[PDB]
């Protein structure tokens, strides 16, 4: 019925997020890399 | 019932996480391009 | 019954996801603003 129904939609949704917060965290984590090491760079030659 | 009050406060803190994680994604994509611009022209000045 | 069950364990997923999710925000909080202080001393000195 209607709670079945929405524990069934809850269970997607938290499916779908654990996914997104995967991809960014991974993402966020590799594009630090390359930030950090292009600012390192500017101020040894400034 | 019992239950039900569960799965509604299971509800309200996954709404409460979506909203707060679309928001982080969309300002990390965003100061993600700035940033990287911001490089690009120290680099060319440098 | 299999319903409540699938409710705690969907509690406890979103629990965890809540504590991961402080986590990277607090420390993408906080590695923005060092690396916008960066920038702008970099700026500051051409």
Same mark, same amino acid.
């Given at each position: 019925? /209607?709670?079945?129904?929405? !524990?069934?939609?809850?269970?997607?949704?938290?499916?779908?997020?654990?996914?997104?917060? /995967?991809?960014?965290? /991974?993402?966020?984590? /590799?594009?630090?890399?390359?930030?950090?090491?292009?600012?390192?760079?500017?101020?040894?030659? !400034?």
């Amino acid at each position: 019925g /209607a709670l079945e129904e929405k !524990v069934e939609q809850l269970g997607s949704s938290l499916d779908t997020l654990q996914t997104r917060f /995967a991809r960014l965290l /991974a993402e966020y984590n /590799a594009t630090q890399m390359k930030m950090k090491q292009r600012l390192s760079q500017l101020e040894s030659q !400034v």
